[PDB]
Structures are given as C-alpha cells and as structure tokens.
Amino acid sequence: LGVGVQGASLYCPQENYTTKKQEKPQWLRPVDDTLAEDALDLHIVVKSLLCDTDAFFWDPTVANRLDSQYIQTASDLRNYRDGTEIIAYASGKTGSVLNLTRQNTLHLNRHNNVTSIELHSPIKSIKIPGASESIGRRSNLVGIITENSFQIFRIESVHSRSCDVMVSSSEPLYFVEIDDLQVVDFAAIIDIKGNWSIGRIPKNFNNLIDNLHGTIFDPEELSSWKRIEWFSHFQKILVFDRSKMIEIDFMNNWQTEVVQAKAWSNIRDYKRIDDKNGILLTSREIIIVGASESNDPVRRISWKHDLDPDDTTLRITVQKVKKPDHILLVAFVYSMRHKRIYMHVFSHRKANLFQSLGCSTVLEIPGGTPTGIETILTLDFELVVDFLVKLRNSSEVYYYALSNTVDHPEWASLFNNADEREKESIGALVSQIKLKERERISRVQNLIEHENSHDEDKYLQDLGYRLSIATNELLESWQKTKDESIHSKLKNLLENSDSFASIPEFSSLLDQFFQYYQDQDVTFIGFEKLLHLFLHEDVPGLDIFYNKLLQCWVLVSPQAELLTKEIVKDIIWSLARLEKPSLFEPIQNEISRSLSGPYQDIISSWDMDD
C-alpha cells in the first residue's frame, strides 16, 4: 500500500516522476516510488511460421479471425489428461470457414488436418472465454459471432492417436430483432448495438435468452463498438462503448456508471487479464490497469500509464508472467494503420503494490499492418515472452518469441503480356540491341588500336577546322538578324565527334578553340566549373572527371574502358550549348520588354537593391 492515490484514480504516467513516497527510513533505498529500478530490457524477435490459409474508414464490428489457447475437454476429467492446445481460424473466400501441439515452439501437429466446419455468414469475431482457477478446470466450449446468426461450438474429446479434433455445435440463433450483435464473453452473453441480454447454454446438442436484460443506449454516441466482460466472479458485468463504462450487477437491480470518457479521450480496447483481480483497460491517451477491490468487488483503479500515441484504431493484448516473488503484466498495444507495437512493464506484489518499469517499442513485417495479436499462455531476471501476430492484407500467421537476451504485384500486373506472336515481336528489340551494341564495342576498339597517332592528330586538326568556319558560318547570321527586338545546337556537323580518341586532347582542343574567339558575338560556358553536378563534389577539371569514373566502373563492365570513354565523350557533346553571343545580345533584349509594358511595371522591375 503506497500513498499517492486519488481513491477515484491512480497514476504512474509517462516519465513524469510518479506521485508518491512513503519515506521508509530503512537504509534500503528509503523511498517506494511507483517507478521501480532495474537494468534495461531489449526484445528480439524469433520469426517463424505457424500456419496459413472506401478504404478511408474501417469497420469496428469486425473483431478478430483467430484464437489460440489451451483447452481441456470432457474426457480429460475422468482420465488423467490435463490440457490440449488449439488454434481455430476463419478461412475460405469471404471469411466463412472456421477450422496444434507444442514441441518446443508451437507448430501445427503431425496429422495436421483442418477441421473445416462450414458456415454461410462472414466471421467477425472468434474468441473463447478463457478459464477459471476457482472452477479448477478449463472450459471446452467456444462461441463465434457472424452477421446472420450467433454460434456456439463445443470441443469434445480431442484425439491423440489421430491428432483429429471432432467438433460439435449448438443451435445458431438467427435474429428476431434486426440489429448486429458485437461481443461475446462467458467467464450467449452478448452485446447488441445498444442493448444486452443473458443467454443460456444447454447440455444437449441432440435436438436462449433468460428473463433479465438491460440496455446502455446513448443517443449521442455514434460508433458501433461495444464490449462486455464479467467482472470478479460476482456475476457483475462490465459494458462498454467509446464513451462510458457502465457497471451492471444483474444479481440485484444495480447499475453504476464508473468511467465517463466523453471529454478528452475514448475507450479503445478492454482485455480481461486471467488474474481475477487485475484487469487492463486501454483508453485513448492513457493505459489503465484498474483491478478489483477486496472490500467491494467494484473497481480498484490502479496505477495507470499515460501512453503517448494518438490514434483511432488501437487494440491491446496482455500476457501475465508469473514469477515466485511477484507477477508481471506486460501490455502490448497495436494499431491497424501502421506496423508497430508499444509495450510497458508492470509488476504486482502481495499488498496491491502495482508498479511500473518503463516502455519500449519494436517493429513488424513490412507487408501490411497488424490486425490480430495473441499471446500463447506458455502452460501457466531474463524475461522471455512469446506470441503470434496477424497482419492485415495478408492471410499468413507467424509465431514470435521475445527474449531479454516490399514486392507489389501491381508492377507485375503492368508487364508480361500473354501474346505469343507479340512475344518475340517485342523480344526482337532485345535481340536487335545484341547487334547494335557489339558494333560499338568493336568500332571504338579500332580506336583502341591506335594511340595518339599523327593520323588522328590530322583527324582532330580536321575537327576544329569544321568547328572554326562552322562557327564563322553560325556567327555571320546573328549579326544581320540582330535587330530582332522580340541558344544554338552545335550538332550541325554529322561527320565527326564520333571517332575521336583522346579526352585530354579535345579538352585542350576546345580550350584551343576557346582562345581563338577574342571577338564579339561569341562567348561560352566553361565545363570544368559545371561538370561536378554528377559526382556531387568539387570537380575542377574534365581530365580528373574521367579519373573519377576510371576507378568507378572497373568491375561491372567487360573490359570496362571504352564504354566509360564514350560517355565522357558524350557529355561534353551532350551540353552542346556553346553558342552564346556576347553580353550585348540579352542586355538589348532586357531594355525592349520594359518599354513594352506600361509605366506601372517600371517600378515593379528593379533587381540589385541591397
């Protein structure tokens, strides 16, 4: 019994240095904050398979599609047997076909036979009630919820010689009132959209609602998410919407509103922890582990943690970890929109000493978002814990253990036509390039055969001569057309700039060509102060620009050289804009436009102010 309570509420929130101290002067850390002390706790997935099989909104009424818990059947009472583990999941086309043992990790068994009982309605929830330790035994009956009816299955004498579970069923009650029910729990006790009733389970499958019922119907809650749970064996129930928790005990006529969650948060999920005292609630904006009180079994609102994520689709599952000194309660919240879990570690001792340790987060598989996560009970400081997930938009279920110590078919469905006459007609082009490339690896190889020849020194003396007079031909039009009052190509010669075999020479040759035009109507843009845009560093030269690609394309090409040469021989001819006039030509085209606009755009056009 620590001290800092409200009576009504009780907080240990997110790293805000919790609100109590006893001042126990015992030289033994003389403080008992709700915050505990230990080392870290990092978690590591053990990824393994178990089994297999408009969008701007989401349906709250659909709950799960699977379940996994140890079941002890009817014939295990008289005989020695105690506890068999099952997993029952929906399958089929629209989610309509509901269908085991543990070696060291939970895997599907030897005879691995799906017991496909057939329905004609969409599966929307699959859950057991659980068990009791005051009853001493385990329940051997499970109930499911569909759109058209409500069903109860009864698991009778699970077999060990054949690994086959024969299943029995009750009467699927259809709807007398046309309103879609939401949640089942037993501890046909069901919650319809706005009202509930108690259903009676029979003993005879060889061939309903009791005389007491209640309702919580709110005219101003709009959602279709409800929930029901039995609380603390008194035959008290707890009923939920997204706005309040009502406590109802149908033993008497006694109804109390406990949670009222309209103002700043909402009720999101509610797991009843197998501890018959402690039960964990997920609100929006806070995580609540409100237990039961020994005086009146009504609600011991215990140490709750302010969770940070704000969302509309959060769930929770919890696993108890039973140590001989104390009881842990790790709580796993998960969302349907992204791929993350969020955990927190609670501890419990004998004097209702609920505490808190810290939080951590890990990730999931990149394809989909999680939609159903369940912990295997594991039959019951180096904390170990294990569980199964299920991701939305994939029908696979994997198994995970946590210890203390991107392909889309839409891009596939865009290619690959089934047109066999058009198959090689497309495929000719991939064989057409088998010809055109091998010429290019061989023709510049003939330029690899020659090395700085005077015969190609002549070929580059001939190069600039048809660059000089071609410039002298491309200059002499622009002077006479200069009075335009309202740049060029450098691909005019289609005889050369194909078979020139030196990078440092032509870099000098264009610098030899740059120096020639001291006159007007001809300026340039320098390559070496601009060629760095591909390497994203300081590249002050054209000759060292090759030297970067020289070490770069060594491994990934057969003989690796003239391909690297030809692209460097391409880019300077790819920026073939060396045909700027002098400064006069755009400056005289500046002055013409401001004359044409009115005197209102004179003051609007002023660069170079400060």
Next chain:
Amino acid sequence: LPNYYVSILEGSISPFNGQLYNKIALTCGMIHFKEFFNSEISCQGLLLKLVMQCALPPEFYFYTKQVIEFEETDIRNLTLWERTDERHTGRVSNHAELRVLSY
C-alpha cells in the same frame, strides 16, 4: 501585404502531384519558349544520373538511348510542352523528363 496575398507568397506545402510540371506548362503557354530558347532536354545527363543512382552496369545507358530513338518524334531535342488550349492536364503526360521516366 494582405494575408492571402502572403500565404501564397510564403511556401507552406511542397509542389505535389505534378504541380511543378503544370506550372512549367502554364508559364510556357504565357510566354512561348519556342523560337527563342531550345526545348532540349540533356537526356544523356539524365540517364547518366539515373545510371549513377542505382549503380547498374552502364550498358543500360547505351540501351536506353537506343530505346528512345525507337519511339521519339525528331529523335533528339526532347519536347518541353506548353499548354494554352485547355485547363485540363495532358493525359498523355507529354512532359519530356516524365517521358524518360517511363523509358
């Protein structure tokens, strides 16, 4: 300056869903980029950029240059596309750099 005259002026949200390409074409419809400027994409640089993105064997550089030659009007000189007739977008997606993204 008025608030809606400055909320346009201060850039809040980035250009998205081809907002940048439309504003290129809307500008080129206002003042004509032809017969005074060269609507010429240096596609050799863009493919060399896209070769240098994912470290491929550079034979696909030489392939893609050949591939555009198979399907292109006036083989070089890639078309910067003005629009003034419609306020609709060009569903052919006639942006030349956006065309190379498919090639």
Next chain:
DNA sequence: TTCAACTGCTTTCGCATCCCAACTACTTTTCCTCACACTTGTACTCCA
C-alpha cells in the same frame, strides 16, 4: 418678580453605475489548384 436657551469672544509670524483588459475561438478575407460529367469516331468482331 425669576428660569432657561441662544451666544460672541482666548494668538502673535511661520510652520504643516461606468469603463478597461485577457485568452482562446471562430471567422472572414480572398486567391490559387484540379477534377467530373458529357460526346464522335474507331476498333473487334457481329450476321448477312
């Protein structure tokens, strides 16, 4: 021939209901960016 209220006077200079404001809300001012329904041919065969 007396009782009981109306009566002006103590010094000598100089000191000494109306308005305002707070914070948080909600709203208007507009300008900018595209889609959604309509229609003729053309294409792929349709029945003559």
Next chain:
DNA sequence: TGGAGTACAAGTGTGAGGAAAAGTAGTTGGGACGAAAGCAGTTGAA
C-alpha cells in the same frame, strides 16, 4: 464481302476544393489635531 452495334481514348464545359494570417467571438480578470468662560437679552412660571 457491305452493315449493325459499341468500348477506348482524343477531346470539351461545369464549380469545388485548398490554404493562411489577419480580424472578431465569449468568459474571466481587474479600475477607483477641537467634549473652551462667565454673561446677556429674552424668557421660564410665580
């Protein structure tokens, strides 16, 4: 070996959306140095 029906895309009007920093909407805070004397005409009733 010409016609009857018909989906794929080139191509054309209607308003509906998006955003922000300015202003304005209701509560609460707050603004206002003096308890002097014998004496006299009028005036009490005898």
